[PDB]
Swiss-Prot record:
Annotated region described as Heparin-binding, given as residue ranges: 32-63
Its job: Functions as a cell surface receptor and performs physiological functions on the surface of neurons relevant to neurite growth, neuronal adhesion and axonogenesis. Interaction between APP molecules on neighboring cells promotes synaptogenesis. Involved in cell mobility and transcription regulation through protein-protein interactions. Can promote transcription activation through binding to APBB1-KAT5 and inhibits Notch signaling through interaction with Numb. Couples to apoptosis-inducing pathways such as those mediated by G(o) and JIP. Inhibits G(o) alpha ATPase activity. Amyloid-beta peptides are lipophilic metal chelators with metal-reducing activity. Bind transient metals such as copper, zinc and iron. In vitro, can reduce Cu(2+) and Fe(3+) to Cu(+) and Fe(2+), respectively. Amyloid-beta peptides bind to lipoproteins and apolipoproteins E and J in the CSF and to HDL particles in plasma, inhibiting metal-catalyzed oxidation of lipoproteins. Promotes both tau aggregation and TPK II-mediated phosphorylation. Interaction with overexpressed HADH2 leads to oxidative stress and neurotoxicity. Also binds GPC1 in lipid rafts.
Source species of the chain: Homo sapiens (Human)
Source species, domain of life: Eukaryota
Note on domains (UniProt): The transmembrane helix undergoes a conformation change and unravels partially when bound to PSEN1, facilitating cleavage by PSEN1.
Parent-protein start and end of this portion: 460 to 569 of 770
Designated name of the protein: Amyloid-beta precursor protein
Source species taxonomy: Eukaryota, Metazoa, Chordata, Craniata, Vertebrata
Binding partners and assembly: Binds, via its C-terminus, to the PID domain of several cytoplasmic proteins, including APBB family members, the APBA family, MAPK8IP1, SHC1 and, NUMB and DAB1. Binding to DAB1 inhibits its serine phosphorylation. Interacts (via NPXY motif) with DAB2 (via PID domain); the interaction is impaired by tyrosine phosphorylation of the NPXY motif. Also interacts with GPCR-like protein BPP, APPBP1, IB1, KNS2 (via its TPR domains), APPBP2 (via BaSS) and DDB1. In vitro, it binds MAPT via the MT-binding domains. Associates with microtubules in the presence of ATP and in a kinesin-dependent manner.
Induction section of the entry: Increased levels during neuronal differentiation.
Expressed in which tissues: Expressed in the brain and in cerebrospinal fluid (at protein level). Expressed in all fetal tissues examined with highest levels in brain, kidney, heart and spleen. Weak expression in liver. In adult brain, highest expression found in the frontal lobe of the cortex and in the anterior perisylvian cortex-opercular gyri. Moderate expression in the cerebellar cortex, the posterior perisylvian cortex-opercular gyri and the temporal associated cortex. Weak expression found in the striate, extra-striate and motor cortices. Expressed in cerebrospinal fluid, and plasma.
Length: 110
């Protein structure tokens, strides 16, 4: 149940920044913070998927090959879901543009 555990840290992190979004007035500088945290979470999830790929391949090689397609979507879900979160905040073209500039600039160093 580790995969689900990683999702929580990312979920709450996303739902947490969203709270500031609705704050009104929202803190585009505080909201961008939770983002870098939520992001770092989705990263651990992706890497966690890789481990599952080889793990299931060792314990369950038969199904491991059948679940491959599932484990694959997992990695995509990490980045794909990231795009979904942006849409939620994008709702605020005003904040979305201010946070996006600093957010993208904050992860560059990563």
């Amino acid at each position: 149940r580790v995969e689900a555990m990683l999702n929580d840290r990312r979920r709450l992190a996303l739902e947490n920044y969203i709270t500031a979004l609705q704050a009104v007035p929202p803190r585009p500088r505080h909201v961008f913070n939770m983002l870098k945290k939520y992001v770092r979470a989705e990263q651990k999830d992706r890497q966690h998927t890789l481990k599952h790929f080889e793990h299931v391949r060792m314990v369950d090689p038969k199904k491991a090959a059948q679940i491959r397609s599932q484990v694959m979507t997992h990695l995509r879900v990490i980045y794909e879901r990231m795009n979904q979160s942006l849409s939620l905040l994008y709702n605020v073209p005003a904040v979305a543009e201010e946070i996006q500039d600093e957010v993208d600039e904050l992860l560059q160093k990563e």
